[PDB]
Amino acid sequence: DFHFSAIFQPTDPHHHQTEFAKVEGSEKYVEEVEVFGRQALKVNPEALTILAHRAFSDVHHFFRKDHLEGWRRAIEDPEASDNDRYVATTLLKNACIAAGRVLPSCQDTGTAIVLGKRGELCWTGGEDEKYLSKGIWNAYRYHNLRYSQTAALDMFKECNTGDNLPAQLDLLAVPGSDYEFLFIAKGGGSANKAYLYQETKALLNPKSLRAFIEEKLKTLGTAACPPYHIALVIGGTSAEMTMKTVKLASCRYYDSLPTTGDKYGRAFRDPEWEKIVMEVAQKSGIGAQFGGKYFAHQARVIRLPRHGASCPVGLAVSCSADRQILAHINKSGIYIEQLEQNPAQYLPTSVKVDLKRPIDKVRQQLSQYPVGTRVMLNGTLIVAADIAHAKIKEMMDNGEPLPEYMKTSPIYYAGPAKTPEGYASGSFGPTTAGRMDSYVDLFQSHGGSYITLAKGNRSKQVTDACKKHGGFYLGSIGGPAAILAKDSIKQVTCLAFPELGMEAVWKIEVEDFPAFIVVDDKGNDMYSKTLA
Amino acid sequence: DFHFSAIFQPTDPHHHQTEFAKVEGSEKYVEEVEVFGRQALKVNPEALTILAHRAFSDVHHFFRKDHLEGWRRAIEDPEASDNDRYVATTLLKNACIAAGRVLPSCQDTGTAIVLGKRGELCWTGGEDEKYLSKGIWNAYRYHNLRYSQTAALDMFKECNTGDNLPAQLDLLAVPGSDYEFLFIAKGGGSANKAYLYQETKALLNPKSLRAFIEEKLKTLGTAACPPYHIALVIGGTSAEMTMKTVKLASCRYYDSLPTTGDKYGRAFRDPEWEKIVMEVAQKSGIGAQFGGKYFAHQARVIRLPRHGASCPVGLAVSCSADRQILAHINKSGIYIEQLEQNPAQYLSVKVDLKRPIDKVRQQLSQYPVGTRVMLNGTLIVAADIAHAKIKEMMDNGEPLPEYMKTSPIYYAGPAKTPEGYASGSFGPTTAGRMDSYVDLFQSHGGSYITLAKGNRSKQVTDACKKHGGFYLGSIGGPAAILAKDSIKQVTCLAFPELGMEAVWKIEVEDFPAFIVVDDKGNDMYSKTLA
Ligand code: SF4
Ligand code: SF4
């Protein structure tokens, strides 16, 4: 006989385990009515604007307790490495700055994602996408965030949209008369560490699956600012469903699923395999960015049904800029998840490098030290990320020289958020280094980019380039954009390509800017053992 | 100033370009009403059951014109190879048999996927998932389809659900008072050829993008029964959004998008790059399964906005079992897309298996790869779970079973047998998924001859050379004509609890195949899919 079984059967579908705050007076936006014997809720669509505006403000200044507790664990665990403790302390101090509500926790204020669940009898007037987008627009326009969206005018010609739109608006039709939401401000670096694998039944045994996990976790590297919330989804009804599920799992949205399967194919969380993922992450030695135990805060593993011919697998992370917030609109008004507004309660050796010297003397100083050495940088950085590198390569392909401004100072891969009134800099942490790997040998062959500063492990071509050309790659801590702006970045000026907005080439002056020597001029790489 | 711009701005959002038939009497399930001054629609949820049942019945017996036209093009084009024409003719003849409404076009009757768009003022009572699922359950239970869904009792212990549930039910909240749908019966093999790449700005130039397309298309191989509808999505707001978009593009759901971008980041189809994809597909020589020009029916390329730090890319195909139906419910009733009910308007070495296997191997050794053969005799049928169970038995010290040593191994899983028929639809599954077993099984005295579809990895070529084996490629997709004309007896041999994934013993006549891998290190795909 027919038995309907929903794939997802959370025991807490409305997220009662989360603490919510009411938006004061917001009952004025809703009215209970009855039509054809059924209870319905009229919702003024301005409620959607108000809610999205608050969500995409709050999430940039505060974190959940589970995330903060993870950093505290990395500080207090005797098994944490010294670098684990240093990185987690830096990230907690960054969170304390961000809680001042001026500087966002990361310069990459993300793509705005809305998962909405509109009841059959929740009546908004139907212009939900426009009103949510207006709230998002307000959040990014009137706060010190960043416009991160790139429009395609044609296949290759691009421009920044200038407002962090469009958003990803996934509005679902569900039972009832309420409107439920998950808002995510998703960083690009962690979005890029969402991977889909097309596997088979041959994977589905303990030995094969553990070996697969060990291999795939290393491909995350440190490129998305660990400690990570790691999510792994085994199975699914389509690739897109697997990838949606792994995103939501990384946001802890599926924490209340059953922990056993059944003959109807329901989804389940698998605590045994979560523990295995954590053991693999800890034993990998990758650590909280620079070697140790704290590659991961926690793990979520969701097993899904599959077509017999298929086994899609999703792997994804939430990075240090772990930013999501639940909300709902009901007969009592607008409710939004309460994040931790006092992160300070979770709080309990270097070589000084003067960059205000000829770059060849800086190279000479760095050559004295092994990979893993912590340095403190003082002086000028030239800032250039993806679009600037591509434009400069295009100029060189058309016969122009590498610009002189690429030869005078170390190159910092970064893109700043907007500058608060009275501040020298907005949040201004590093970009993922690996995306620039194809340029390093070329630029060094033309006399520049001998020292680069960014975050994440890099490919072998960069290690080889630095050995051939007497170069270095310095790893900033990834994620602490607010404390870097507040304490280290003293002056920012636009140097080239002003038309590119935040993706222009900048000239910045820094003090006490921490980094580790990741790649030296001798063929060595701090990550060569843990990310072999 | 603020300007809202939806990412997707089709000029034909309601699919007016599609022809629909109304389900007779279905106005009884709907009532137009007015609530607080706006137009609304009451829908009896039984309409959802009726609609899903009809959609997931019709789609297994009929195709769209764009798909059928592609097979005709492959036959009529002087530049098509002989193998292109042979494969396209076989697939058209298969479609003619499926249009008899008894045998489905493919044994893999797919995962049931529903994209639904429920208007704000379309009121069903809210139990939409249950009522849609009942209609799907009805379609798979009361017709000669297949139960393809595998439930996980724990991480590794699995069972077939026995009813082709659960479905993928993606129900969206949209403006208005109607209910619009795309139903997809998605085969596993083409589902597996949905790929996500995480790229960078360094890809976004003509030379790099062309080279990327040329490399990634080859990774599709023939493993999802081409000619393909190829979809490519460049950009997206997340990996899952890129992958949803490439799925929908492959279903021609986004055909009416704009063809230029703007400063607000709207999605667009890119005809220039569609033409480039088609040029790459034709020049690859991969062909309609066995070399030629007809790797692809057509291409869809959608360019999306992206976060400056990100460039997700999706690549996906619709296979020979190209199965989707549009539908809508409105104040007049239930409307369902009309597919082509008259596909007919669009129109070797004999190998006796009734011998010791060593004699069959000796005969096959006389011929080069690319030779077309006709098989007559017993095939032993075993796919993914059966292979895993047999490996496990051997790892625990048990023999390779006798039934892996007597006959060619056909990798397949049958659909249900119609009353009065010898066999349900019964075409091949993708060979590559069994590659990890070939050397092992041959080392232990069996699986010397395998029969399936798709190009295989180098380990299989090496195994067949080391052990004196062969891989035979059936045409991929023509499951109904194979069942009607070639399969004479079917018996479950082992592991009956696995449903369609049991081991079967079948007796066949006139079963066509090509020698893809021989016993000498040669592979029919080595030039085109190196
Ligand atoms: S820089 Fe790091 S913390 Fe910020 S969004 Fe990118 S991956 Fe996340
Ligand atoms: S066997 Fe071929 S035609 Fe049938 S669903 Fe699989 S890929 Fe598609």
UniProtKB/Swiss-Prot annotation, chain B:
Is Cytoplasm one of the keywords? yes
Q: What is stated about the way this protein's activity is regulated?
A: Specifically and competitively inhibited by 2-thiomalate, which coordinates with the catalytic [4Fe-4S] cluster. Weakly inhibited by malonate.
Recorded catalytic activity of this chain's protein? (S)-malate = fumarate + H2O
Q: Which GO terms describe its biological process?
A: fumarate metabolic process; malate metabolic process; tricarboxylic acid cycle
**Main location class:** cytoplasm
**What does the UniProt record say this protein does?**
Cytosolic fumarate hydratase that catalyzes the reversible hydration of fumarate to (S)-malate.
Q: What class of enzyme is it?
A: lyase
InterPro entries, sorted: Class-I_Fumarase/Tartrate_DH, Fe-S_hydro-lyase_TtdA-typ_cat, Fe-S_hydro-lyase_TtdB-typ_cat, Fe-S_hydroAse_TtdB_cat_sf, Fe_dep_fumarate_hydratase
Q: What is the designated name of this protein?
A: Fumarate hydratase 2
Gene that produces this protein: FH2
What's its EC? Answer: 4.2.1.2
Give the source's domain of life in one word.
Eukaryota
> What is the species of this protein?
Leishmania major
List of residues binding [4Fe-4S] cluster: 106, 225, 319
This protein's cofactor list reads: [4Fe-4S] cluster
Question: What family classification does the UniProt entry report for this protein?
Answer: Belongs to the class-I fumarase family.
Subunit and partners: Homodimer.
User: Where is this protein found?
Assistant: Cytoplasm, Cytosol
Q: How does activity depend on pH?
A: Optimum pH is 9.
Which GO MF term does the entry hold, naming one? protein homodimerization activity
Q: Which residues bind (S)-malate 1?
A: 107-108, 146, 189, 383, 429-433, 453
The record's remark on the cofactor is:
Binds 1 [4Fe-4S] cluster per subunit.
* Keyword vocabulary terms for this entry: 4Fe-4S, Cytoplasm, Iron, Iron-sulfur, Lyase, Metal-binding
Residues recorded as binding (S)-malate 2, renumbered to this chain, are 192-198
Entry GO terms, CC = ciliary plasm; cytoplasm; cytosol; glycosome
NCBIfam families recorded = ttdB_fumA_fumB
